Amino acid sequence: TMNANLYKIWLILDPRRVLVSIVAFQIVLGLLIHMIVLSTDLNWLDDNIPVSYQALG
Amino acid sequence: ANLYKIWLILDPRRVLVSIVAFQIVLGLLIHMIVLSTDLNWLDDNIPVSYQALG
Amino acid sequence: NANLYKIWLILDPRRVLVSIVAFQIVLGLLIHMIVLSTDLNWLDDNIPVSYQALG
Amino acid sequence: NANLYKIWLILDPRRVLVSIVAFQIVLGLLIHMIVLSTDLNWLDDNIPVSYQALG
Amino acid sequence: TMNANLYKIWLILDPRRVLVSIVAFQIVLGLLIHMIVLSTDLNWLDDNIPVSYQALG
Amino acid sequence: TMNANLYKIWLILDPRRVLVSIVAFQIVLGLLIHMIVLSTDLNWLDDNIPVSYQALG
Amino acid sequence: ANLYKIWLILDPRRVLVSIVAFQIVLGLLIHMIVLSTDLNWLDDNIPVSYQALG
Amino acid sequence: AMLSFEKKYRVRGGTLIGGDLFDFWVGPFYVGFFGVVGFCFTLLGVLLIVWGATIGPTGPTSDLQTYNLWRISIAPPDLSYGLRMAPLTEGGLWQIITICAAGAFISWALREVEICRKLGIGFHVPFAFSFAIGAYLVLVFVRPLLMGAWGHGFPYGILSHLDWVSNVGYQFLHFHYNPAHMLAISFFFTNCLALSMHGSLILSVTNPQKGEPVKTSEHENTFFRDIVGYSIGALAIHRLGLFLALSAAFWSAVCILISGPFWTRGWPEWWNWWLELPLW
Amino acid sequence: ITHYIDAAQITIWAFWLFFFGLIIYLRREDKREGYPLDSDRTERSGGRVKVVGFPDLPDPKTFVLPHNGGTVVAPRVEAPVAVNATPFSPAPGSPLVPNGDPMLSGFGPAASPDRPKHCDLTFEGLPKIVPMRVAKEFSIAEGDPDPRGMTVVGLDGEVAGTVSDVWVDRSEPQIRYLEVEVAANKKKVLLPIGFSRFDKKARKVKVDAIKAAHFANVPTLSNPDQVTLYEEDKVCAYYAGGKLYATAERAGPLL
Amino acid sequence: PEYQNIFTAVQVRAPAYPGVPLPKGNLPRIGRPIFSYWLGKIGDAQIGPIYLGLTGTLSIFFGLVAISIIGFNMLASVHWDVFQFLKHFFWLGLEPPPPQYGLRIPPLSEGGWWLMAGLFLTLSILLWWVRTYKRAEALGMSQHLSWAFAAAIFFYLVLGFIRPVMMGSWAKAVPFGIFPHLDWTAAFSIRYGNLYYNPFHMLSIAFLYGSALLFAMHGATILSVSRFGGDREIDQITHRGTAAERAALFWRWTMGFNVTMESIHRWAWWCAVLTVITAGIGILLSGTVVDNWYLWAVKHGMAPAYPEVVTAVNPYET
Amino acid sequence: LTDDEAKEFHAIFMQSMYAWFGLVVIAHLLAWLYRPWL
Amino acid sequence: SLTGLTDDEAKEFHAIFMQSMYAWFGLVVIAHLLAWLYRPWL
Amino acid sequence: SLTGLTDDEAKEFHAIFMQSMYAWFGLVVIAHLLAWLYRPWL
Amino acid sequence: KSLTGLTDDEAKEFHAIFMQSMYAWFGLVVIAHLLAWLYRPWL
């Protein structure tokens, strides 16, 4: 149900600064989420799956 | 009823930019707070514990 | 009082609105945080169940 | 006094109103926090019940 | 034992600054004295009079 | 499934300036990812593979 | 095929100097990293321990 | 919005990196390449601090996790990790936040350089800010490297880092006798005296006694000659204040840099070279 | 008897109340220049909305100038002044680009306000900053070279002219400007000491701010024996424009 | 490259300034001013003249007595041996009276000299305060310097007089000596359960660090605009120039807000003054109200908790 | 703002505030039923 | 006169201010009555 | 006006604003429905 | 005379390219999460 005149937001919000803002925020957010998940039981680097490589050595 | 006239008083752009910034911060804050509690869904070993697989 | 509307000839309606919004949000965050620091805490009260116990 | 109204010829009503409001808000937060730091605390008194108990 | 020309003090000292200063001084003094009295045997908030409300729950 | 006027992005962002930003972001990201991987069981420097070179002496 | 045009949009000399500064820093970093691991070649007492020799 | 005299200074260019790509303001803030880069480092670091508070030292369910502002602490790794990256939950989080902090600080300083270039002013402020950054880097990079472990860094906690300072200091029995520390403190105290003198003097001549006109350069000089027989001068007091503040930071960095890397015994005993001179 | 409230806790809370009151005081003082703000919100509101933030502006203070120089008030209503530049982009927050020759635009680091058209004065009421020709009681400190007669070079090492005099501060003795007789047009122009490096053994003054040929357009003094505040700012700002404008490389970026 | 305006490359000279004329009742100034070339490299080359009326003469007399009593006692403590006085100088001191004497005037041989030096140094400082006050009055200037000086005097008085009197003993005051007053500083924190956990200690540190932050910022800001005459702050305050505009915009663009040329000096004034106000309050509360700052911080919920990796059996328990 | 403009703002301001207070009461009535605190 | 209000404007602001302040004090008294009934503190 | 917008311009922005806000709140309730079904917290 | 400098036609043109690009980005995000859920479901 998007408004037909939703495009007019770019008459209020500048394209270049919004684009920069989104890229910066998304880069931070992806780095944050990876580090949050890595510090939990969902950690996929330290789970010795499929094998522990410090164990085989 | 004449509530649309709020945009004759408060600047629509600054209200918009304020809402976006506020909601993102609030969203980050609430996820953190819940993650500090029993409700934490990342480190609860549900549906299983993946470190117990290794 | 009847002439109470004339307060918006004294205090700027635009500034007052923005002050109310900012105060209320800060007050709401403060009150939730205070309540969570007490016995009334509804997040870590293991109600209706303890979810960490399920693991 | 019958001419006490003339206090508004020397003190700015806009400044006095905002100052009173600012003072009252600070005082209210201050008093609540003082009472919370005494026997009168109504949040952590486990009355009517202790909610952390159920768990 | 009141002087008749004491009203002429307001020809010497600014009446507005005096009144402002009086209100500020009284508010600070009132806060101060409450805290001093609270910090003595006269403490009326944390004295379990008429009852201790923490001992109830 | 892209857009045929995606090239118009260079009418909004200065292309030589975007090049420098990408390169320095990618170097920094590469530095981070090697460090994170080194912090885990996947560490290839301290795994004694093929041999432990400290135990050779 | 048109890669030489990079020097039509980026200053050749400052690209060079960036490369030199970056490479030297990176070299010190990597030597530091290797030295802090099992691959350390200075204190591995190979071919021999010169201190225990005295 | 802009200051009422600001628009005539908002010029294009003067960037070090980025050019037109990031050459714009956001409200009052100038952005530029180092604004974008610094913003990412800053937002990441802060959010990792909040994440570290969320899970605490031993997990979010333990009694040690806390959002109490004084008690939150994100700590460096055990000394046993040496110069390697620890696991995130064993000090690695502290290490990533450290790299974010250094990048945020250095990007802040380079943004300041771009602003100086726009305004055509001297570079004293980013030069001076570099001394604070240098002291931070002595604390988390130079001194840990010389002793062999990133775990010699201080923890990121409002009160927990005061525990670090106390225990590092008393490793040397009586840290007050550190000679570079005595010199640095002398600079900190002298700087505070000089600042109160300078602030006072400017305010007392621009806000003179009632009925008086604004005072003069001759009054400023006369006033301290009258008290101490000397006036350093209105330009030179700013030279002096900058010299004292930067000297305080510089001798700070020196005093912690020698504590461990270049001296391991008690600090009073250092002064035995003096006591042992063959003069007395 | 035991109580949670204690005097240390009471006193620290009392400090916070004082401190936040102090900050609001200070932020008001901070708004005695430059406010209300120039915004695009005041433009579209037809001037109805004044942007001042929080706290609001203080009531004006008065500065009474000596020697019957008049009264300065702060804050004060200041007239808008046209900007000799065009926006690089129409988006808000974009920079502007100087019109014409940048050195001469009065824009960017070439810009400055219009200070008053009278001189700063000594306590006794004489023009404060004057050439040594006028203040004959001044001399060069023994041990230091006399700048008079030295050759002035621009950023590219080319000869801009010769130092014809030295302008000193009679209130606090120090050089504030060198007077340069410009080779190209034989005009005598001020050169701020802040933009001057001495090469003592060569008897050369080096000026990094501008090229030798840029000295021809240094703003000129109405009276050769004194300088007004207004002219001081116009002179210093002209050199500073060179820091960004005098060569192409100075625009940046490096990479 | 550019001139940094750190050192004056070319000094000029003029006949020495005798100073702004003072109103009737002030004594004539004394001293024939001289010029120092090397001081003239960093600042003003003129030394002198100086004002000296009754207030300052009395101040200096009290202060020399106090200083001489200290030095005399230091030398006596190495049995008049001047060579050992130089060897041990940083260690020597004039010691507060023993606790057995309380607040009574103690014997000359065991604390009377400390009490006299503290009395006479204190009067010397109080008279110096009056001097700073009078010197501003005679020039028609406001009293900002004497107010800030009073804040420092407050802290000094708390250290050596107010707190010792409140605590009933001159033995609780500060010794006069280099390393001895450092011993006292460390011992005070030990005795009162770790001064890091005193909240007014924390504030005083914030303001001491803040003072160096602000003078680095302001000192550097003014030198970066000295090319526009920004060091002449009086006329930048009455007649805003491009120095003051560029200074404010540098900071607004950096950190989002800015002050004025006048009001930065108010920020600086309060930051420096609050350093010693909070310091006085912090010491004033130690021993009188709070006996152990760490336990005060535990009680109010501030002290961090750590995983237990070392611990010790209490032999007083066993 | 004119006199009639103050009347118009005040009428809309009061209805908006009481509605806000209405939500507060409903939120607090729900909270009392779930977890009475006095 | 010193503020800018007329002698009538000061009479009008005083009337509304006093009725407003007495109303606020009424809310305070009601709240303290309710507090005394729930938790007498003297 | 104080924002400069005409009366019809405020009606236009309000229709898009209110529509967009309601959509966002609809997403919020749906998320809180899924979260209540997956992990009720009261 | 818009605030950004874009005409109405330019806003429409930018909006259509912005929406397609954001949808494509969200599409990759959904694919990433479907794969993550198949490998390591977390609820």
Ligand code: BCL
């Ligand atoms: C058990 C606890 C629950 C959980 C319960 C909740 C609840 C309840 C809510 C969220 C909401 C969010 N959650 Mg969650 N959440 C969980 C786990 C995750 C994790 C994770 C790694 O585990 C991630 C990264 C997220 C991410 C998110 C965001 C997508 C969203 C907050 C957006 C915001 O702040 O808008 C701020 C930005 C704006 C307001 C800009 C304006 C809107 C623009 C146009 C849209 C932005 C993106 C939009 C939200 C798209 C997401 C819709 C999806 C269908 C969710 N959740 C789990 C499994 N989560 C919120 C949400 O989805 O709101 C609809 C929300 O109400």
Ligand code: BCL
């Ligand atoms: C045992 C301890 C008691 C308690 C006994 C008291 C007593 C006694 C009083 C309060 C008062 C207040 N308490 Mg309490 N209070 C308790 C618990 C709470 C808790 C909580 C989470 O536990 C909350 C958030 C509150 C909140 C409040 C506010 C509603 C009010 C202070 C407002 C103010 O300062 O005005 C400052 C703002 C202004 C002056 C602006 C102008 C006023 C405007 C026009 C009115 C705004 C709406 C107003 C706040 C509506 C509330 C009035 C009702 C009669 C409650 N209390 C408990 C259970 N509380 C006070 C009060 O109600 O004042 C009448 C008061 O006298």
Ligand code: BCL
């Ligand atoms: C068990 C946990 C899972 C895992 C589950 C997920 C899930 C789920 C997701 C990712 C996503 C990502 N994962 Mg992962 N991830 C895992 C392990 C890895 C590892 C690793 C070392 O283990 C690496 C390095 C990554 C890396 C990545 C990235 C490719 C991506 C985040 C991109 C981003 O934030 O852009 C930031 C965003 C932007 C910059 C905006 C979009 C960019 C567009 C395309 C155009 C911008 C161009 C612009 C002009 C220039 C940009 C350059 C600038 C100069 C900086 N993952 C494992 C195995 N991962 C996400 C993804 O794929 O997104 C689709 C995602 O949804």
Ligand SMILES: CC[C@H]1c2cc3[nH]c4c(c3C)C(=O)[C@H](C(=O)OC)c4c3nc(cc4[nH]c(cc(n2)[C@@H]1C)c(C(C)=O)c4C)[C@@H](C)[C@@H]3CCC(=O)OC/C=C(\C)CCC[C@H](C)CCC[C@H](C)CCCC(C)C
């Ligand atoms: C060298 C002399 C002194 C000095 C000078 C100095 N500092 C300066 C400057 C100068 C000239 C600036 O120009 C710059 C500035 O812009 O000031 C307004 C700055 C500054 N000095 C500041 C702080 C500061 N300076 C201090 C000290 C000093 N600065 C000296 C004593 C201290 C002390 C003594 O502790 C602090 C706290 C800031 C106000 C500002 C730098 C602002 C900045 O870099 O912003 C970018 C970063 C953020 C917005 C936050 C980053 C968050 C991180 C990514 C995560 C946090 C990690 C951190 C390591 C955790 C620490 C936790 C615990 C220790 C509590």
Ligand SMILES: CCCCCCCCCCCCCCCC(=O)OC[C@H](COP(=O)(O)OCCN)OC(=O)CCCCCCCCCCCCCCC
């Ligand atoms: C622990 C308890 C708290 C401790 C705090 C101690 C503070 C005092 C110690 C320092 C002494 C300073 C003396 C000099 C003062 C001075 O000089 O002020 C005067 C000068 C003005 O002079 P001028 O230059 O304009 O003109 C000179 C021509 N005569 O500056 C100031 O107006 C600064 C403004 C004062 C600060 C305002 C603080 C208000 C707090 C309000 C809190 C409200 C909360 C309400 C809660 C219910």
Ligand SMILES: COC(C)(C)C/C=C/C(C)=C/C=C/C(C)=C/C=C/C(C)=C/C=C\C=C(C)\C=C\C=C(C)\C=C\C=C(C)\C=C\CC(C)(C)OC
């Ligand atoms: C031999 O020496 C000669 C003669 C050549 C001169 C040399 C002198 C030298 C070398 C002196 C060296 C001095 C040094 C190194 C001093 C170092 C001093 C330090 C570091 C002091 C630090 C702090 C001291 C403090 C804060 C002391 C405060 C004491 C106070 C405030 C006491 C006040 C006492 C009062 C008001 C007493 C009143 C007496 C009453 C009224 C109570 O009597 C009943």
Ligand SMILES: CCCCCCCCCCCCO[C@@H]1O[C@H](CO)[C@@H](O[C@H]2O[C@H](CO)[C@@H](O)[C@H](O)[C@H]2O)[C@H](O)[C@H]1O
């Ligand atoms: C100018 C005069 C100023 C007067 C200043 C007075 C300010 C007082 C503010 C008190 C701060 C609020 O203090 C409130 O009270 C109780 C104390 O019973 C705190 O309660 C907590 O205190 C401590 C510290 O963790 C615990 O040991 C205690 O068991 C716990 O209940 C609440 O976490 C807090 O919400």
